[PDB]
Amino acid sequence: NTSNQVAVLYQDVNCTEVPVAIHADQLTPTWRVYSTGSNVFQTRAGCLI
Amino acid sequence: DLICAQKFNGLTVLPPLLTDEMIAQYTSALLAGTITSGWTFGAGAALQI
Ligand SMILES: *[C@@H]1O[C@H](CO)[C@@H](O)[C@H](O)[C@H]1NC(C)=O
């Protein structure tokens, strides 16, 4: 109702692993850009992109 | 490890929302209201005595 943007949390995982974790070279291009950016924040719950 | 055999098989553990020093901030705001206000802070605004 408000927007179409999303954030994605990868639970209990260090984000020095995410772009090879997500199937980046073998997926849709819209799952591709939800692996990169300057918006990468490492929490205790996981990594928030 | 004890936890690594569980973690390798699909069994994860999620963290609590309030950290252990947020819960300790809550109980010190309940100590400080009882000592300085009596019982009045649980029924409205805190009145000192
Ligand atoms: C994630 O990787 C960084 C890179 O050195 C490391 O400092 C950090 O401790 C790691 N976190 C883990 C393994 O939970």
Tab-separated table of N, CA and C and ligand atoms in Angstrom:
chain	number	residue	atom	x	y	z
A	1	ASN	N	0.814	-1.203	0.000
A	1	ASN	CA	0.000	0.000	0.000
A	1	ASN	C	0.853	1.260	0.000
A	2	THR	N	2.058	1.193	0.553
A	2	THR	CA	2.925	2.352	0.695
A	2	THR	C	4.012	2.410	-0.369
A	3	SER	N	4.719	1.309	-0.603
A	3	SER	CA	5.826	1.305	-1.545
A	3	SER	C	6.021	-0.098	-2.099
A	4	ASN	N	7.031	-0.240	-2.947
A	4	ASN	CA	7.405	-1.524	-3.512
A	4	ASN	C	8.816	-1.934	-3.143
A	5	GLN	N	9.508	-1.161	-2.318
A	5	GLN	CA	10.864	-1.503	-1.928
A	5	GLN	C	10.860	-2.493	-0.779
A	6	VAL	N	11.922	-3.289	-0.701
A	6	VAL	CA	12.074	-4.279	0.350
A	6	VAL	C	13.508	-4.243	0.845
A	7	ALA	N	13.700	-4.736	2.057
A	7	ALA	CA	15.011	-5.077	2.565
A	7	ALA	C	15.031	-6.571	2.832
A	8	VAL	N	16.223	-7.148	2.863
A	8	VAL	CA	16.390	-8.590	2.962
A	8	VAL	C	17.376	-8.875	4.079
A	9	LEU	N	17.007	-9.757	4.997
A	9	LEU	CA	17.877	-10.172	6.086
A	9	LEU	C	18.316	-11.607	5.862
A	10	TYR	N	19.620	-11.839	5.910
A	10	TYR	CA	20.203	-13.170	5.796
A	10	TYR	C	20.620	-13.606	7.187
A	11	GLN	N	19.862	-14.514	7.784
A	11	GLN	CA	19.941	-14.743	9.218
A	11	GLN	C	21.168	-15.552	9.608
A	12	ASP	N	21.834	-15.097	10.677
A	12	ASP	CA	22.952	-15.786	11.335
A	12	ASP	C	24.130	-16.021	10.396
A	13	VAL	N	24.439	-15.038	9.554
A	13	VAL	CA	25.420	-15.204	8.487
A	13	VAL	C	26.235	-13.930	8.319
A	14	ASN	N	27.547	-14.121	8.234
A	14	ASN	CA	28.470	-12.999	7.971
A	14	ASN	C	28.329	-12.633	6.498
A	15	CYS	N	28.315	-11.350	6.183
A	15	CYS	CA	28.151	-10.886	4.829
A	15	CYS	C	29.439	-10.608	4.133
A	16	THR	N	30.359	-11.553	4.340
A	16	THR	CA	31.564	-11.619	3.498
A	16	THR	C	31.226	-12.868	2.671
A	17	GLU	N	30.044	-13.485	2.895
A	17	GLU	CA	29.626	-14.693	2.209
A	17	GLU	C	28.417	-14.538	1.310
A	18	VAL	N	27.734	-13.395	1.326
A	18	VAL	CA	26.402	-13.307	0.714
A	18	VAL	C	26.380	-13.397	-0.817
A	19	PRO	N	27.226	-12.672	-1.586
A	19	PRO	CA	27.072	-12.759	-3.061
A	19	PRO	C	27.363	-14.128	-3.660
A	20	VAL	N	28.193	-14.945	-3.013
A	20	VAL	CA	28.364	-16.329	-3.440
A	20	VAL	C	27.332	-17.231	-2.765
A	21	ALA	N	26.706	-16.764	-1.684
A	21	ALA	CA	25.615	-17.510	-1.067
A	21	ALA	C	24.349	-17.418	-1.904
A	22	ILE	N	23.886	-16.190	-2.154
A	22	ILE	CA	22.801	-15.994	-3.097
A	22	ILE	C	23.297	-16.399	-4.487
A	23	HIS	N	22.393	-16.965	-5.284
A	23	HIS	CA	22.768	-17.647	-6.518
A	23	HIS	C	22.962	-16.633	-7.651
A	24	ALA	N	23.969	-15.769	-7.464
A	24	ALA	CA	24.013	-14.457	-8.112
A	24	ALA	C	24.235	-14.556	-9.616
A	25	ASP	N	25.169	-15.400	-10.049
A	25	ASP	CA	25.410	-15.588	-11.473
A	25	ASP	C	24.437	-16.566	-12.121
A	26	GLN	N	23.460	-17.086	-11.378
A	26	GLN	CA	22.511	-18.057	-11.912
A	26	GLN	C	21.093	-17.771	-11.415
A	27	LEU	N	20.693	-16.498	-11.409
A	27	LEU	CA	19.350	-16.133	-10.977
A	27	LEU	C	18.846	-14.961	-11.813
A	28	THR	N	17.605	-14.571	-11.529
A	28	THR	CA	16.973	-13.383	-12.075
A	28	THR	C	17.775	-12.123	-11.735
A	29	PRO	N	17.758	-11.110	-12.616
A	29	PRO	CA	18.559	-9.904	-12.355
A	29	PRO	C	18.041	-9.052	-11.210
A	30	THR	N	16.819	-9.273	-10.738
A	30	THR	CA	16.323	-8.483	-9.623
A	30	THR	C	16.735	-9.089	-8.282
A	31	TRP	N	16.998	-10.399	-8.228
A	31	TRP	CA	17.696	-10.968	-7.077
A	31	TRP	C	19.191	-10.652	-7.093
A	32	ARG	N	19.727	-10.211	-8.237
A	32	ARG	CA	21.152	-9.908	-8.353
A	32	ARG	C	21.519	-8.643	-7.591
A	33	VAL	N	20.747	-7.566	-7.776
A	33	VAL	CA	21.053	-6.305	-7.101
A	33	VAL	C	20.649	-6.294	-5.636
A	34	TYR	N	19.954	-7.322	-5.153
A	34	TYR	CA	19.813	-7.507	-3.710
A	34	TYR	C	20.928	-8.398	-3.173
A	35	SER	N	22.157	-8.068	-3.561
A	35	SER	CA	23.365	-8.632	-2.985
A	35	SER	C	24.475	-7.609	-2.811
A	36	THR	N	24.324	-6.396	-3.335
A	36	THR	CA	25.399	-5.417	-3.417
A	36	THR	C	24.885	-4.068	-2.925
A	37	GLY	N	25.714	-3.048	-3.090
A	37	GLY	CA	25.402	-1.693	-2.689
A	37	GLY	C	26.276	-1.231	-1.537
A	38	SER	N	26.157	0.062	-1.237
A	38	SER	CA	26.714	0.602	-0.004
A	38	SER	C	25.801	0.373	1.192
A	39	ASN	N	24.598	-0.154	0.963
A	39	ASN	CA	23.661	-0.477	2.030
A	39	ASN	C	23.853	-1.936	2.410
A	40	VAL	N	24.883	-2.177	3.213
A	40	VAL	CA	25.141	-3.478	3.813
A	40	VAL	C	25.481	-3.236	5.273
A	41	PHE	N	24.662	-3.770	6.169
A	41	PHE	CA	24.767	-3.522	7.600
A	41	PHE	C	24.799	-4.871	8.298
A	42	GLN	N	25.830	-5.109	9.096
A	42	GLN	CA	25.992	-6.369	9.803
A	42	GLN	C	25.471	-6.226	11.222
A	43	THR	N	24.437	-6.984	11.547
A	43	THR	CA	23.801	-6.989	12.851
A	43	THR	C	24.125	-8.293	13.556
A	44	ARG	N	23.546	-8.475	14.733
A	44	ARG	CA	23.642	-9.770	15.384
A	44	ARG	C	22.612	-10.743	14.849
A	45	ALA	N	21.527	-10.241	14.280
A	45	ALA	CA	20.505	-11.101	13.718
A	45	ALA	C	20.908	-11.693	12.386
A	46	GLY	N	21.970	-11.193	11.776
A	46	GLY	CA	22.377	-11.627	10.464
A	46	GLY	C	22.943	-10.453	9.715
A	47	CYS	N	22.802	-10.418	8.397
A	47	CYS	CA	23.258	-9.283	7.617
A	47	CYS	C	22.078	-8.703	6.861
A	48	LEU	N	21.942	-7.388	6.908
A	48	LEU	CA	20.769	-6.685	6.415
A	48	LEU	C	21.156	-5.881	5.187
A	49	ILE	N	20.573	-6.215	4.041
A	49	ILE	CA	20.946	-5.628	2.761
A	49	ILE	C	19.769	-4.834	2.227
B	1	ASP	N	31.767	-29.539	18.893
B	1	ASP	CA	30.817	-28.796	19.713
B	1	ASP	C	29.473	-29.475	19.880
B	2	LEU	N	28.730	-28.978	20.867
B	2	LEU	CA	27.353	-29.394	21.074
B	2	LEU	C	26.419	-28.663	20.124
B	3	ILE	N	26.680	-27.379	19.890
B	3	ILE	CA	25.817	-26.573	19.040
B	3	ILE	C	26.122	-26.761	17.554
B	4	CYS	N	27.336	-27.183	17.191
B	4	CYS	CA	27.688	-27.270	15.777
B	4	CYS	C	27.024	-28.452	15.085
B	5	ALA	N	26.766	-29.543	15.808
B	5	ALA	CA	26.031	-30.661	15.223
B	5	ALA	C	24.569	-30.305	15.008
B	6	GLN	N	23.998	-29.505	15.907
B	6	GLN	CA	22.645	-29.010	15.698
B	6	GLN	C	22.603	-28.023	14.547
B	7	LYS	N	23.571	-27.112	14.498
B	7	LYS	CA	23.583	-26.055	13.497
B	7	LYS	C	23.804	-26.611	12.102
B	8	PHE	N	24.502	-27.731	11.985
B	8	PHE	CA	24.758	-28.332	10.685
B	8	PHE	C	23.562	-29.076	10.117
B	9	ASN	N	22.470	-29.205	10.863
B	9	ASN	CA	21.358	-30.046	10.448
B	9	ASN	C	20.057	-29.286	10.271
B	10	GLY	N	20.090	-27.962	10.268
B	10	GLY	CA	18.902	-27.168	10.072
B	10	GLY	C	18.336	-26.524	11.312
B	11	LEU	N	18.955	-26.702	12.469
B	11	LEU	CA	18.371	-26.275	13.738
B	11	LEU	C	19.076	-25.016	14.209
B	12	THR	N	18.454	-23.868	13.982
B	12	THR	CA	19.032	-22.577	14.318
B	12	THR	C	18.355	-21.976	15.542
B	13	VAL	N	18.955	-20.910	16.060
B	13	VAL	CA	18.470	-20.202	17.239
B	13	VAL	C	18.461	-18.713	16.936
B	14	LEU	N	17.310	-18.075	17.110
B	14	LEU	CA	17.010	-16.673	16.857
B	14	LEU	C	17.250	-15.834	18.105
B	15	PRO	N	17.749	-14.611	17.975
B	15	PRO	CA	18.062	-13.810	19.150
B	15	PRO	C	16.837	-13.082	19.669
B	16	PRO	N	16.800	-12.749	20.952
B	16	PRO	CA	15.670	-11.996	21.487
B	16	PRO	C	15.681	-10.557	21.017
B	17	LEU	N	14.506	-9.942	21.042
B	17	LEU	CA	14.377	-8.585	20.533
B	17	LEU	C	14.968	-7.570	21.495
B	18	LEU	N	14.642	-7.669	22.771
B	18	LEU	CA	15.229	-6.806	23.779
B	18	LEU	C	16.530	-7.424	24.254
B	19	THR	N	17.625	-6.684	24.157
B	19	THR	CA	18.887	-7.189	24.662
B	19	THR	C	18.892	-7.179	26.187
B	20	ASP	N	19.913	-7.800	26.764
B	20	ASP	CA	19.967	-7.947	28.208
B	20	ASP	C	20.280	-6.654	28.933
B	21	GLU	N	20.733	-5.623	28.238
B	21	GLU	CA	20.915	-4.329	28.858
B	21	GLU	C	19.783	-3.375	28.553
B	22	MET	N	18.862	-3.745	27.674
B	22	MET	CA	17.604	-3.029	27.586
B	22	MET	C	16.651	-3.453	28.679
B	23	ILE	N	16.680	-4.727	29.058
B	23	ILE	CA	15.839	-5.224	30.133
B	23	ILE	C	16.319	-4.688	31.465
B	24	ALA	N	17.618	-4.485	31.622
B	24	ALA	CA	18.125	-3.895	32.849
B	24	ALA	C	17.867	-2.403	32.937
B	25	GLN	N	17.643	-1.732	31.818
B	25	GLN	CA	17.215	-0.345	31.864
B	25	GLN	C	15.774	-0.223	32.296
B	26	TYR	N	14.954	-1.206	31.955
B	26	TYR	CA	13.559	-1.211	32.363
B	26	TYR	C	13.398	-1.426	33.855
B	27	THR	N	14.162	-2.329	34.454
B	27	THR	CA	13.990	-2.539	35.879
B	27	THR	C	14.632	-1.463	36.718
B	28	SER	N	15.503	-0.640	36.167
B	28	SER	CA	16.015	0.471	36.949
B	28	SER	C	15.122	1.687	36.870
B	29	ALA	N	14.285	1.781	35.850
B	29	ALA	CA	13.247	2.789	35.799
B	29	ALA	C	12.047	2.425	36.639
B	30	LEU	N	11.933	1.178	37.061
B	30	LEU	CA	10.910	0.774	38.002
B	30	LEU	C	11.389	0.863	39.434
B	31	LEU	N	12.686	0.683	39.679
B	31	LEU	CA	13.248	0.985	40.986
B	31	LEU	C	13.210	2.467	41.278
B	32	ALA	N	13.551	3.296	40.304
B	32	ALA	CA	13.648	4.723	40.552
B	32	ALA	C	12.301	5.377	40.716
B	33	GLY	N	11.238	4.772	40.199
B	33	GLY	CA	9.918	5.313	40.419
B	33	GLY	C	9.327	4.918	41.746
B	34	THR	N	9.728	3.781	42.291
B	34	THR	CA	9.190	3.346	43.569
B	34	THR	C	9.840	4.096	44.714
B	35	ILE	N	11.120	4.402	44.586
B	35	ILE	CA	11.847	5.056	45.659
B	35	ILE	C	11.491	6.531	45.735
B	36	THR	N	11.265	7.172	44.601
B	36	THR	CA	11.037	8.601	44.592
B	36	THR	C	9.574	8.998	44.519
B	37	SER	N	8.670	8.114	44.114
B	37	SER	CA	7.275	8.481	43.949
B	37	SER	C	6.298	7.651	44.740
B	38	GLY	N	6.691	6.515	45.262
B	38	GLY	CA	5.745	5.681	45.967
B	38	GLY	C	4.991	4.810	45.006
B	39	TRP	N	3.670	4.821	45.092
B	39	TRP	CA	2.859	4.059	44.161
B	39	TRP	C	2.178	4.917	43.119
B	40	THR	N	2.426	6.215	43.109
B	40	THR	CA	1.638	7.107	42.285
B	40	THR	C	2.018	7.056	40.824
B	41	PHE	N	3.204	6.578	40.494
B	41	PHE	CA	3.632	6.567	39.105
B	41	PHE	C	2.993	5.454	38.297
B	42	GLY	N	2.368	4.486	38.944
B	42	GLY	CA	1.641	3.449	38.261
B	42	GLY	C	0.199	3.766	37.998
B	43	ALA	N	-0.279	4.919	38.453
B	43	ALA	CA	-1.650	5.339	38.232
B	43	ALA	C	-1.756	6.643	37.473
B	44	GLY	N	-0.641	7.243	37.089
B	44	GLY	CA	-0.659	8.501	36.383
B	44	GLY	C	0.723	9.091	36.257
B	45	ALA	N	0.858	10.371	36.569
B	45	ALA	CA	2.155	11.016	36.593
B	45	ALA	C	2.780	10.848	37.964
B	46	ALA	N	4.103	10.818	37.996
B	46	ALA	CA	4.827	10.535	39.222
B	46	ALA	C	4.840	11.757	40.128
B	47	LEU	N	4.367	11.595	41.359
B	47	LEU	CA	4.352	12.657	42.357
B	47	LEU	C	5.342	12.309	43.451
B	48	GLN	N	6.305	13.182	43.699
B	48	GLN	CA	7.366	12.852	44.634
B	48	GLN	C	6.894	12.968	46.078
B	49	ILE	N	7.576	12.247	46.960
B	49	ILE	CA	7.291	12.214	48.390
B	49	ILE	C	8.575	11.752	49.071
C	1	LIG	C1	32.906	-11.900	9.738
C	1	LIG	O1	34.098	-11.647	8.963
C	1	LIG	C2	34.966	-10.649	9.530
C	1	LIG	C3	36.136	-10.503	8.589
C	1	LIG	O2	37.372	-10.692	9.264
C	1	LIG	C4	35.388	-11.042	10.949
C	1	LIG	O3	36.162	-9.997	11.525
C	1	LIG	C5	34.161	-11.324	11.806
C	1	LIG	O4	34.555	-11.784	13.092
C	1	LIG	C6	33.296	-12.375	11.132
C	1	LIG	N1	32.132	-12.691	11.945
C	1	LIG	C7	31.777	-13.935	12.303
C	1	LIG	C8	32.651	-15.053	11.808
C	1	LIG	O5	30.787	-14.150	12.998
